Amino acid sequence: FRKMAFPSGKVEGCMVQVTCGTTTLNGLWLDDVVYCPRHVICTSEDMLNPNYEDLLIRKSNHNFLVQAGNVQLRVIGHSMQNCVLKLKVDTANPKTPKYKFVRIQPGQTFSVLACYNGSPSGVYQCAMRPNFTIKGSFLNGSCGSVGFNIDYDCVSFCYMHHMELPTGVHAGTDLEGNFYGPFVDRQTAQAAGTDTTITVNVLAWLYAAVINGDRWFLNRFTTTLNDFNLVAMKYNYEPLTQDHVDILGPLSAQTGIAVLDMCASLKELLQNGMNGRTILGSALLEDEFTPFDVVRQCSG
Amino acid sequence: FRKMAFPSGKVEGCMVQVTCGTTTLNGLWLDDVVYCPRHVICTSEDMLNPNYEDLLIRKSNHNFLVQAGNVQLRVIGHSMQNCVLKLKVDTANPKTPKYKFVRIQPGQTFSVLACYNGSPSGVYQCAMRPNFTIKGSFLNGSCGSVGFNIDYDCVSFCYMHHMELPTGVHAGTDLEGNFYGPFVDRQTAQAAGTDTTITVNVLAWLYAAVINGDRWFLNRFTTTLNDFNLVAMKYNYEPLTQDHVDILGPLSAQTGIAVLDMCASLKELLQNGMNGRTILGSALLEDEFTPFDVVRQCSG
Numbered sequence: 001f002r003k004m005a006f007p008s009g010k011v012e013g014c015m016v017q018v019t020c021g022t023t024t025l026n027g028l029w030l031d032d033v034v035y036c037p038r039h040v041i042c043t044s045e046d047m048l049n050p051n052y053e054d055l056l057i058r059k060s061n062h063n064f065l066v067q068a069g070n071v072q073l074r075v076i077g078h079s080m081q082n083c084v085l086k087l088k089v090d091t092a093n094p095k096t097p098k099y100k101f102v103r104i105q106p107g108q109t110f111s112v113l114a115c116y117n118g119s120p121s122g123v124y125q126c127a128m129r130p131n132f133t134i135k136g137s138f139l140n141g142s143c144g145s146v147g148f149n150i151d152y153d154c155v156s157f158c159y160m161h162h163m164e165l166p167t168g169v170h171a172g173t174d175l176e177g178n179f180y181g182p183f184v185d186r187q188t189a190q191a192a193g194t195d196t197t198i199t200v201n202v203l204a205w206l207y208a209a210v211i212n213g214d215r216w217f218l219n220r221f222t223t224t225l226n227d228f229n230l231v232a233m234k235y236n237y238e239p240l241t242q243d244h245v246d247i248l249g250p251l252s253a254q255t256g257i258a259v260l261d262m263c264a265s266l267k268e269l270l271q272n273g274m275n276g277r278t279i280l281g282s283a284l285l286e287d288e289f290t291p292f293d294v295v296r297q298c299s300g
Numbered sequence: 301f302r303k304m305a306f307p308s309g310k311v312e313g314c315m316v317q318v319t320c321g322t323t324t325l326n327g328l329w330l331d332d333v334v335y336c337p338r339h340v341i342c343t344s345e346d347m348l349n350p351n352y353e354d355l356l357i358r359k360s361n362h363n364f365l366v367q368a369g370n371v372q373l374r375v376i377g378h379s380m381q382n383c384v385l386k387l388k389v390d391t392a393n394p395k396t397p398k399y400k401f402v403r404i405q406p407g408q409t410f411s412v413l414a415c416y417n418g419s420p421s422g423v424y425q426c427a428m429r430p431n432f433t434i435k436g437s438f439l440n441g442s443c444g445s446v447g448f449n450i451d452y453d454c455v456s457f458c459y460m461h462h463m464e465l466p467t468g469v470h471a472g473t474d475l476e477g478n479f480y481g482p483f484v485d486r487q488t489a490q491a492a493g494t495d496t497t498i499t500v501n502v503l504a505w506l507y508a509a510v511i512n513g514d515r516w517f518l519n520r521f522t523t524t525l526n527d528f529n530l531v532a533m534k535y536n537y538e539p540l541t542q543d544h545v546d547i548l549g550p551l552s553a554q555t556g557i558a559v560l561d562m563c564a565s566l567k568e569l570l571q572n573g574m575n576g577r578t579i580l581g582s583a584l585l586e587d588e589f590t591p592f593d594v595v596r597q598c599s600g
């Protein structure tokens with residue numbers, strides 16, 4: 001059972017290089033609009049305490065160098081929407097896929113196409129942590145790299161990368177420029193909340209495990225929703241609602257294991273640990289597979 | 301530190317659907333040639349003990365239904381090269397990337413574009429095990445899905461998926477149709493050798509860990525190449541040669557840690573275990589990152 005990313009093809013043909021002064025980073029070219037982090041306009045000094053309006057006013061269209069591979073793009077318009085810069089260009093992207101912009105909830109997953117100088121380097125699947133960070137692989141220049149889900153032919157862009165934190169975790173925005181979490185595009189010490197495990201994702205993965213013939217963690221015991229949540233809250237697991245239980249229904253019915261019997265299996269792993277054993281070749285409990293990711297991988 | 305796959309775009313535009321009788325699977329459309337597993341010609345009954353020459357002789361070009369998205373392709377020629385079928389078609393693939401065919405060594409890594417009915421569903425990074433299997437996510441119809449590395453603009457195709465084994469691991473061929481390992485495209489119980497850990501990959505990942513600020517596993521001790529190998533062979537680790545040490549040189553010089561000091565760190569993890577601790581958020585020792593994968597991710 002592999003952590004699979006979406007095919008990156010449709011997104012690869014939207015990645016452009018954006019330079020403003022010294023600073024270079026990645027932009028997303030959809031229709032006649034390039035989207036990038038607004039901090040492209042900042043010098044290393046500005047990043048400490050920037051007035052973005054004031055900094056942006058000193059910039060004209062011709063200050064923005066947007067390159068797609070070997071072709072230069074002329075900017076005919078620029079605006080700031082929250083923490084993203086929208087550069088209007090002359091040429092609509094011929095490779096623009098059917099797309100929308102979505103703001104995802106904590107615990108949902110997406111594919112990141114990690115880019116450097118408008119050029120894709122690699123793809124991976126990650127989860128939006130309950131504390132609105134991501135544990136990712138982002139070097140300097142990776143900024144403007146985007147997160148996406150693909151439904152049929154439609155790319156849903158959910159994330160654009162802005163910054164790494166002292167923790168080494170990553171913060172960024174939706175494609176409207178609203179940060180996930182309490183974070184600002186400013187170089188100051190910024191605390192992410194205490195992170196919690198995505199309980200509904202872990203259960204989904206225990207169902208994935210059953211389906212793939214790993215059943216050892218299954219026990220005789222059962223439990224209640226309340227009695228479980230009091231174990232969850234102890235072990236910094238996100239509490240389980242009836243919505244979470246209803247979302248797991250397909251997997252419960254597929255394997256013939258009631259959600260609350262699986263919950264009881266989990267308690268004994270949380271209380272007793274793993275005992276040196278593994279589940280789908282993993283010594284830890286995996287929470288970066290949604291119930292939807294598990295069903296889509298198990299049915300293809 | 302994420303397990304990153306290559307961007308799949310260039311490979312996505314080469315995936316076609318191939319049907320012969322009832323059996324449907326994926327093909328790779330490069331120039332005027334489609335490549336697929338030869339077992340596309342087998343009925344469920346034939347797969348038990350097939351005479352491929354005899355089965356192929358009963359088939360003519362017009363028996364092979366090759367579809368690319370919504371466009372049908374006429375076959376003007378068919379041949380068997382080892383375990384792959386080469387279908388010559390009228391139309392050269394317009395989306396054919398610069399490509400070559402390579403046979404990789406055990407312990408090397410590649411990206412798999414998992415496909416169903418000629419349509420890409422997802423991408424992941426895996427290693428060719430020392431026993432020439434891969435631990436992958438392949439449902440029925442996934443056959444013909446390909447493994448690849450990307451150097452600059454050049455796709456190097458190394459693997460095509462043929463079969464799952466009783467173990468639940470996966471076997472397949474190079475693009476010339478030669479199986480990795482002792483496996484045959486036949487539905488019989490087939491034993492993979494005892495698998496070993498890719499020692500040079502694990503060391504590369506301990507260097508990745510140091511670079512990313514996780515240094516706890518580092519010890520005062522050192523060791524010798526022989527004294528280490530006698531611990532390696534005990535713990536089913538592939539023995540370490542001077543070639544392996546020379547390949548780790550860049551990472552040794554980058555972090556200022558001699559290979560043999562890292563080897564000594566590893567012994568104490570093999571002998572004492574992990575102690576409930578983690579390294580780059582993993583409770584096990586990771587062997588699916590090559591020294592090349594580590595340097596490319598750490599320099600972008």
Ligand SMILES: *[C@H](O)[C@H](C[C@@H]1CCNC1=O)NC(=O)[C@H](CC(C)C)NC(=O)OCc1ccccc1
Nearest residue numbers: 039047138139140141142143162163164185186
């Ligand atoms: C944008 O390219 C860059 C991405 C960083 C670089 C290291 N890892 C990343 O994810 N982001 C920034 O330069 C960003 C700028 C602020 C105005 C938001 N600051 C940032 O990431 O925090 C400082 C930092 C720099 C280098 C390593 C770790 C943290």
Ligand SMILES: *[C@H](O)[C@H](C[C@@H]1CCNC1=O)NC(=O)[C@H](CC(C)C)NC(=O)OCc1ccccc1
Nearest residue numbers: 339347438439440441442443462463464485486
């Ligand atoms: C090709 O589409 C298919 C891929 C298998 C199906 C389950 N997981 C896979 O990787 N391969 C076969 O059907 C193959 C045919 C032989 C002639 C090589 N046999 C195979 O994979 O072994 C039997 C098997 C079937 C279903 C589940 C597990 C093993």
